[PDB]
Enzyme design. Structure first.
Site, PDB file in Angstrom:
ATOM      1  CE  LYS A 251      41.438  62.078  77.843  1.00 21.36           C
ATOM      2  NZ  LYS A 251      40.122  61.737  78.417  1.00 21.36           N
TER       3      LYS A 251
ATOM      4  CB  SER B 257      40.740  57.744  78.397  1.00 23.74           C
ATOM      5  OG  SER B 257      41.190  58.962  78.749  1.00 23.74           O
TER       6      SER B 257
ATOM      7  CB  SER C  45      44.699  58.200  76.512  1.00 29.77           C
ATOM      8  OG  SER C  45      44.170  56.861  75.831  1.00 29.77           O
TER       9      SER C  45
ATOM     10  CE  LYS D 277      40.739  57.611  73.812  1.00 24.24           C
ATOM     11  NZ  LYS D 277      41.910  56.609  74.032  1.00 24.24           N
TER      12      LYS D 277
END
Length: 342
Positions: free
Chosen positions: A201, A99, A39, A42
């Site tokens: 993140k 996400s 992720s 992203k």
């Protein structure tokens, strides 16, 4: 001499600590290794979106139609309905906070027509950022041999995000987001754990372990910590805190020159003006272990045969800072005022 303690050795495949203001890497371990980002991908998807918004090529209220392909994604998702219209702003919150794989795909297709062309923009953007060990195959981070990044590349990306529009970066610290009758928390647990953390993140797979791109601000300093491949959520947070503390406790930041101000002149061939005022695109600040500021000296060398025309912001010369006759931080001198060729 009075050399600060060595950095903690963390239980993790790779990591990097980067100062925010200076952008210098303070600690780096296995920093350029190409690892699956999951992720963390992203961050690139969202960043592109924010740059398109800034360039006025897409608008925050523009309605995005959700394709079947976006709706067919799996994993973490916003739960946008196929065929519905969703604004760029809402999708961006879905990507950043949740996400959301669906939202990632839908916004990528809105921006570039297809996810494959978006990945191209991701790679072009990688180049533009100066990423050395990153390559993207899609907008979500599906596991692929050619889809990889590194701890250093991710810190470079994170810094570009952190210093973008404040209303855009603030999204990273939002704790939850509601869509289509499902309210979900921001996936970044540190947000709730440490009030000085404002992003960014997490990523995780069995293959990549538990990864995190985090940034915190304490006593006027910003640190950016990137860790790949920790053993668990607990270790991820614990190892990141060690890295952060190490940066805050043992490094100091000093502002040398603010962007713009002239540092020196330069010879221009064929220009109406005989010379130009050189300067820096943006503030130059150094971040170094305590007691080191004192050892720094600066060289500002221009280009010998620089010939007009000269555009404002054009690459002319380079300023170099030596730490005891050892060149380190090198910025870019650029012409402030443009110059003709009369």
């Amino acid at each position: 001499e009075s050399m600060v303690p060595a950095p903690p050795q963390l239980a993790a495949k790779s990591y990097v600590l980067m100062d925010g203001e200076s952008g210098q890497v303070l600690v780096e371990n296995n920093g350029d290794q190409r690892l699956p980002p999951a992720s963390l991908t992203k961050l690139m998807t969202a960043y592109i979106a924010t740059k398109e918004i800034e360039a006025g090529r897409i608008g925050e209220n523009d309605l995005v139609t959700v394709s079947e392909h976006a709706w067919r994604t799996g994993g973490s998702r916003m739960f946008i309905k196929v065929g519905s219209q969703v604004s760029v702003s809402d999708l961006l919150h879905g990507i950043i906070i949740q996400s959301g794989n669906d939202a990632s795909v839908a916004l990528a297709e809105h921006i570039a027509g297809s996810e494959d062309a978006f990945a191209d923009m991701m790679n072009t953007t990688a180049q533009k950022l100066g990423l050395t060990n990153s390559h993207f195959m899609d907008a979500t981070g599906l596991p692929n041999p050619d889809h990889y990044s590194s701890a250093r590349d991710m810190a470079v990306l994170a810094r570009a995000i952190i210093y973008g529009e404040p209303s855009h970066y603030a999204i990273y610290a939002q704790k939850e987001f509601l869509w289509n009758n499902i309210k979900q928390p921001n996936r970044n647990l540190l947000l709730w754990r440490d009030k000085t953390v404002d992003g960014l993140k997490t990523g995780h797979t069995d293959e990549a372990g538990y990864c995190l791109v985090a940034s915190a601000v304490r006593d006027g300093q910003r640190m950016i910590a990137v860790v790949f491949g920790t053993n668990s959520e607990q270790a991820r947070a614990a190892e990141t805190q060690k890295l952060l503390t190490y940066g805050f406790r043992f490094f100091e930041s000093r502002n040398f020159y603010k962007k713009g101000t002239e540092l020196t002149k330069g010879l221009v061939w064929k220009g109406s003006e005989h010379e130009v005022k050189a300067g820096l695109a943006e503030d130059l600040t150094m971040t170094l272990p305590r007691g080191q500021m004192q050892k720094l000296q600066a060289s500002m060398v221009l280009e010998p045969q620089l010939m007009a025309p000269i555009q404002q912001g054009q690459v002319i010369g380079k300023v170099e800072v030596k730490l005891d006759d050892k060149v380190i931080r090198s910025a870019d001198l650029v012409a402030l005022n443009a110059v003709e060729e009369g």
